[model samples]
Target: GRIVWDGSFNNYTTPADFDRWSWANQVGTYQWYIKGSGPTSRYLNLDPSYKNPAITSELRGLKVTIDTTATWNSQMMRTELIPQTNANLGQGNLFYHFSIKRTNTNAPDPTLEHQVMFFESHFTELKYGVGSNPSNLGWYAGGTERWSTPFTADTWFNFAYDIDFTAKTVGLWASTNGNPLVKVVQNVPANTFTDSRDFHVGVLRIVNRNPPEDWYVSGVYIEEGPITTQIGDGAAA
Candidate 1:
């Protein structure tokens, strides 16, 4: 598998190190924009223990927390990190991979809607709450549900979006823990579009007044064709 971009926190020695990434300079794996008015440490953590246990190669996992002050553009509570690179991430057939989970402490509120790991266009995204089962995390494309699973605490959910930009179709591949990813949803027609810099790697709560929510992220990368099914060993998959 040919990797085009990597958003892992492996280069970061500490959460504070994220401050070096900014819109003006954009010298890191992530663009540190679209966040709350809190300090970098307040919304991010890079503890080694925060990562997926199954991925033995990853040096750290990112813990993103969205509190009351995490309001971004409007009333929505948002804390996101966009890819910081000039690569054409929106072209060709690419597999967008990432692993996410939540713990009991500061667990996400099922009563409120949360959009995690979405493109700016909202063409396809992982949604929690306001579905057939509020407790289950559903994959939605063009505001329609395609797949879903129970989002219980302490279980890492690994997923990859099989997006064919040339074909203008989207599919879903998913697994739990360190298991290899499997295609769960067939490629379906959708209004998929991106400028390569719009993939959001955090949580965005829609119109809510809930307590702080924490989301753990790891194994983030984008690759071309022949997707890598195995979870990486802290490096390339």
Candidate 2:
């Protein structure tokens, strides 16, 4: 059952291959289910018409990125990963995992620049921020106060964050050049916000900025459990 959904976007020219695993009965919406091909040599074709919504309760692994551009907005070529249902994840341990490769190019302005938000909740309204432009990372637990660190671009890196509800603890990890880099390991219990908000995975594209610029993401995997085990230590490529 862990292999419920899987694809590598290898079929760039054939819409039929995309349609095979996808359901398009909702007129403007499409649902992609696992084709059971395993993780081999394949790629996901990025078509604007293929843009749709999906929800999965059984989230085991996720690792796919767009390899093409869109017509209305080049930045429209992004991904939104969300849970399958609105079930209360309650007060349990959860992990957010991801790896990103920012290609070498002129960075965007800070005011108009955009970044990725991880583990976002509407009830508690919490978010961990990772961005390019200036390449900064931080956590926004609550209030207007923020904490961040400087990061580099045009390279591959592993990012992991953990939330221990019972202990009210949050941890962050990063690695560059295949090496572990602990950016912050604070025990600020007050920094932990509480609420009952559904989680969602989203990528924000700046429309007021320049065109023909995008970021590539892959090797995304998330697991929920206790805080005893380390996340993304050896799982990302």
Candidate 3:
């Protein structure tokens, strides 16, 4: 099938574009700071500054930073923001593509669990599984841990998830930089998110007692029908 939604952040220009993408009329960071208090700079946008890694830029991508050094006064975990699809997608065979890089892991919060991204149908939290500490880069289906990975600053870790919404299952493919997507998890029955479960990507830094942590991301693409992201396939946004 063809691509349904192109989150290839390359579509972004000024930070204001993200505001229009927010779930509410609130502007700027206000629309993003859903859980607790966070710096407005937490989300470094990539709009007119779009970059197609396979062709042009690399390290200069959109970024999210969650700082706990300030008084966040709430509990559970600090939430950054999730893409407000406004019910654009309702659930079916889908694929999510995005590139991520972990730049900082403050030892102060030696146990910081940064939840980079995930899809939720209905839930309290994603079903936990193994991770690079609670704060690693990975894809959790419905709430279950489906795939996880370590970090390297100079490398842009590319990832895609094959989601079978009807069967309540999901799978994944990952690689470094512009390589073809490789299957990581074949197919596993997991928490199935009903189209609007809310697709999120950012630093939900599980800060217990630490400072701020950050990560960079770009080329967020969501599609359907066993999608392929090979460079030659024209899926390398």
Candidate 4:
């Protein structure tokens, strides 16, 4: 069957209001924190930005929470955010993806770390991926994935990623808007999925960083599987 986050706040709150919603250490030096106080009531705060310029390691798994009342905005201070890192096992690759939608024209930053793995955002286009080191490696092959054209915001979409050993592949689909838009598949000889690493979700970093960006995310889901099977036709048993 399928599992959902059910972005409901019957039990959770925002960072500005909730005092018990906090952060904890899962792996490495990364942490996940939540504060209650937004339009929806709570938002996540990550530590040591996953996209930091000094992380190059493998990721095991990710864990995150969802809010249903949170709306999309370009400048509402506390917005939904997810920061990931793989910087312990020496330059290992990580594969992950999720779907999102904007309630308004938030003009999401296409430069977001996982942009490539995005299904629908602000402009309703697919994104591939981003590279860690911008040296001569040319986005590390699967670094910069791809995206679709454009569509309307405030709808449902499907986004996912896959990494085999070192090779990484990401895919995005807006089934609610139409068919899938952007699809990217790549191979990396250095990146691999390891069970020893700690993969976390939710806002991992917010302190000692730039002010809040714009946007809100909901219905976030992730799973491990082949890119083909994820988008391929299937029949419910």
Candidate topping lDDT: 1
What's the C-alpha lDDT at position 17 in model 1? 84
Instruction: Write one digit per residue (lDDT tens) for candidate 3, span 141-235.
Output: 55566665555444677777777777877777777766777887787777765545366665454444445555566766577776765733344
Residue ranges of candidate 4 with Cα displaced over 4 Å:
1-31, 34-97, 105-141, 166-214, 226-237
Tens digits of per-residue lDDT for model 2, 1-237:
021112223233343433433233422112233222322113232432222111121122233332223212343333343333223333555554444544445332234434354444422212223243244534444322245544355455455456567776656555553444454544334344433232434344434333433343433334464321322343422
Q: Candidate 1 on 98-195: residue-level lDDT in tens? A: 99999999999988899999999898899998768999989987778899999989988999999998888899999888788899999888778999
List per-candidate RMSD values in Å.
2.1, 9.6, 4.8, 12.3
- What ranking of all candidate models by TM-score puts the best one first? 1, 3, 2, 4
Error of 3 at 41 (Å): 2.4
Residue 219, model 3: lDDT of 68
**By lDDT, highest first, what's the ranking?**
1, 3, 2, 4
TM-score (C-alpha) between model 3 and the true structure: 0.72
Q: Clash pairs of candidate 1?
A: 57-233, 57-234, 58-234
All candidates: TM-score: 0.96, 0.51, 0.72, 0.39
On a 0 to 100 scale, what is the lDDT of residue 107 in model 2?
38
Candidate 3, residue 234: CA error in Å? 7.4
